[PDB]
Request: fold
Amino acid sequence: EITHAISSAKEQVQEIIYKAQHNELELKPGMTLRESFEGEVSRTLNDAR
Amino acid sequence: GSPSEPIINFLEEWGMEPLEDYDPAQHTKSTRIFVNGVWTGIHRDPSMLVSTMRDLRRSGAISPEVSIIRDIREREFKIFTDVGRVYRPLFIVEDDESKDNKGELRITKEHIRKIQQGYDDDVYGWSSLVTSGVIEYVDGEEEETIMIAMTPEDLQTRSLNDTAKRIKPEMSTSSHHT
Amino acid sequence: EVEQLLQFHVATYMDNDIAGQPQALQKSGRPVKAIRARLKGKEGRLRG
Amino acid sequence: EDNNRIISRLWRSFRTVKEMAADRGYFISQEEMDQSLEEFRSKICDSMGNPQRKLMSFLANPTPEALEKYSDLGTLWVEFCDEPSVGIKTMRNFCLRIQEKNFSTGIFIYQNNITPSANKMIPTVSPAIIETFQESDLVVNITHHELVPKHIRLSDGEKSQLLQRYKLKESQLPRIQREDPVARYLGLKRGQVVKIIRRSETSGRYASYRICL
Amino acid sequence: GSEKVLIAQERSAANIVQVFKKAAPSPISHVAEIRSALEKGSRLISTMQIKLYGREDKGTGRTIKATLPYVKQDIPIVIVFRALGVVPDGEILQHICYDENDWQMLEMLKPCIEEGFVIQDKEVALDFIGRRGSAALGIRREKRIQYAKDILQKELLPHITQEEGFETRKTFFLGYMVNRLLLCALERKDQDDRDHFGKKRLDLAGPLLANLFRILFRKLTREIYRYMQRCIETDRDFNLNLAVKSTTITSGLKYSLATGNWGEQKKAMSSRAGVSQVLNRYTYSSTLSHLRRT
Amino acid sequence: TPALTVYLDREIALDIEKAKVIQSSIEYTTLKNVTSATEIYYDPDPTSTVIEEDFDTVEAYFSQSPWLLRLELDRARMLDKQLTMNQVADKISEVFSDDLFVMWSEDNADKLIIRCRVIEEDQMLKRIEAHMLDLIALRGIPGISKVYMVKHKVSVPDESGEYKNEELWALETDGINLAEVMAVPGVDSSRTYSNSFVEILSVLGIEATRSSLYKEILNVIAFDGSYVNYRHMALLVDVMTSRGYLMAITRHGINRADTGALMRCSF
Amino acid sequence: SFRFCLECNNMLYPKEDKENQRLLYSCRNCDYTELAEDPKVYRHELITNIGETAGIVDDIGQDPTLPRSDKECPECHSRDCVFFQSQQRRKDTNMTLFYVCLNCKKTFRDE
Amino acid sequence: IAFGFADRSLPHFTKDDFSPESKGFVENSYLRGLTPQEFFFHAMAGREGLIDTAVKTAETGYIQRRLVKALEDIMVHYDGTTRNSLGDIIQFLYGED
RNA sequence: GGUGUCUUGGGUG
Ligand SMILES: [Zn+2]
Ligand SMILES: [Zn+2]
Reply:
């Protein structure tokens, strides 16, 4: 179960990376595209753990 | 620390052009060569110059503690013979992309047999390994330009399922590692 | 010159931390422990 | 357009001034309290729409309660001046008119700036008192803010009672600056004591006292 | 009778250009700093910053001014290119611009050209440098020129060379430094990393003893001079075995290695302390670690 | 990090379009924010032109110095900020009444342009261009560099008296201007709050300063779930506001009291 | 892009020929004054993109540290290309990539 | 984990690799054991913690010293008031209750 | 019956 959850989070992060590289990420107020990307990835990985 | 005279002599021999022969109207692509932080010339083709310098260092002609740092985005070639640089040894992966020996370690079981013996078959110690081109030294700056495999098993991707041993990393983003 | 030497000795007898001048020094190279330095700091009279 | 905004801001400032006057103890007609934006524009603006600031200038008399309580409360004059920059000329006229009709207190609301040479005439015009406010400052009534509790100036006898109850001297009280926006809004003079009742999460209600610097 | 170990000293590298950002309430925004030293001796010689005056949207003049050693006021860059022997602004720019197609850098270089438009020859700019050399008052122009020319020759990038007739190489290094400055200023490259371990050096027993011995031996030679000043007056032959007070170097080395204060004894303050420490012999691994400390 | 919390009027506080209009009204935009690239053109004849696009515009604007400024305004930047050519040109003429003569292309024009005329003059044009791009305001309160559309879960009683949550749009903003934002129509002028209690003191008085100071200290302490009893922080904020002005906890604050010399020296 | 003097090798500044109303260019050192081609006298940019694809060299294929992708090269149908993101270092820049083929050295993109 | 090297965290990764493993995600547990890269990143984080612990205590002690000196002369008096050494009133009733 | 002073470096809490 644990390794499946970690693999799922790695796939989610790879999808966020694809979205950011193909200019499809949704920004946040008071926050840059790169800072939004980092915040979303950190949220994803913290919830994975 | 090491004298910079042989470095300068090799650079002048192999094709470095001076700054008294510099004209930025023509040299829009040339790579500038630094020796100990001193800009000493420019070259038309850093590739063969760095290849020859690395072969000279791995053959013993150049002091093993000499940094050879190519920068590609900045179009620079920096050679250091400074005193006080910190360095560490690494194995040398065969990187010439022309022979079946490509992509695996240059050190073999004959070298280990010689190291256990303590002499070559016509004293064989660590320095003989360093001078035979199977281990070289890298400082922090040169470390920027290299691609280090973590373990000798990482040189080849394995095809497992061991619930106890830790998963050695996938390393999937990159199609082919060099 | 000599009256100014007197002025400097009297000053550094009381305060050896005067801005923009050398410090009254001892034989060993250390500066003199002036009264102000006796009174100030973590280790001075008031806090120490 | 921008004329509507200017008129609206001026009307808001006028409403704040009237609330200031009534809070300080002067009697204001109940109809002039509820002065509306359109009725103000009717009574002040022109055919061209620009407003006559000489009609807003009113005269206030002490409410009988604020006379029984604050025996030193005279008659108030409030003037909206017409010159954006104000110099020694306009202050000279204002002080001459205030002393001319024995007005006790004169509030002088200006627009842009009051030059120091004019500013110097404020204290040398005893026994009358001249205060000035900027229109930008008067747009919002700060005593309506939730963080500003209600200030009530004590009378001389009540200040004496406060000092004797606590066996206090004036210098041993908490203090308020004469330039404090709520002290400026209340016309506090040196030595006068406000009473400040305010919310208390441990006791419900708490009365504080500050003396004016 | 006490075991002493020399702790390796960490210092920033020498002969490398580093470009730094600055702070908001500072007119200076970008600073290229280089320290210079020679391959022989490995001793500091001179330091030379090249600052970028003018904040973002403030400080209308976005000129760049160097800071040469031994001068009080910061000289504009075109002035020093002219003092070094390249007056025409086209040649200065060409020494700066390797690629004519680029336009932003050429657009950021004009205010410098305007603030240093007055000068058209080497002597006047070099006097302008001379008027700031922090020396005594009232030196005449012809030798103010010699002082400033000496500053431009030596104490300006001594690692390149300190001899005359090679000013073009110093101009080329100035162009490289200006280009790195502009690349950092135009956000086309990130600012240099102070903590990068490849830009640091470790000073072991060798260089430390070299520094201390150099200090003490210049001390000894000054003593020898102050003795040969007196004894030679007598007009006598002297055998030099009574002319050298050997206790100076011995006492200095012993004092530094026994106290740790790395410097002359009378300058214990302003000297590094703890360079030498009592070798830790509590257990074997503590000794092995203490001998490898930094 | 200065910041305001701008409570909206209730009618606005529930609708989102009205709140966004108030947001647009409160935010500060300069000509930099909508400018792509500025030129300088030599136009020797005011009644004619050496350019081939804007000749019709000035022939329709007609039926001084020969130095012309041709600045371009991107389309999407205007679109996103509800800004058109008309308001921008009006604002430029508001502060450049007679030292400047402005030509402007129309909003539907395939190129959004502005042209200006001066009334050796190759450097006053540069100074004027810099000063326009860096000092012409269009709308909003100076000092408010960003505005956010934030959501606050206030709990208010119902018509039955029972407390129920209620989801309202409020405003947060970078930078601080309490007095001028408090005046802006559509804002609940009686509830605007600032995280800089020096601003509170300058605007609202000393009692509001005490309240704000306690609010900040309670926020900093209770951030991580720590609980300090009320009376201690009440005492700390009462000492800092007792004289009528903010007394910092430093030598510069403590040592300006009237206490004995030995206390002050001991610190 | 301002030029330089054909005689004094300094830079020419704008000026006005009031007797012909034509923008000349005056040398502030010499007396030479030539007719110009472009009536632009100044330029200023804030949304720029020079340095988008410029961070590429011929021998960028020789870099052994660049990650290699499987994108098809539009030019030579080559199944091996190294890739990297925008070499511009501003804060608001994209994370969109650039793609360099090792066969034709033509740069391409995923668009 | 920042790109301390040029465009990478460690020299065992390729440039511009934003995957969790490159920028400091440790997939293993303590029981399973960390890889060398994960070991180094966790060491960086622990070092950050040690620096914080070593360095913030001085600021905190200074703050508490200043607070104590500011409030040292304040006592509840027999009439209930809270006054300083000058006798000036800070609160008319302690804690307002 | 009277067991001296100051700095540097390494640790413990
Ligand atoms: Zn010329
Ligand atoms: Zn291809």
Notes: Residues 1-44 of chain G form a domain with the N-terminal domain of TfIIb fold (CATH 2.20.25.10).
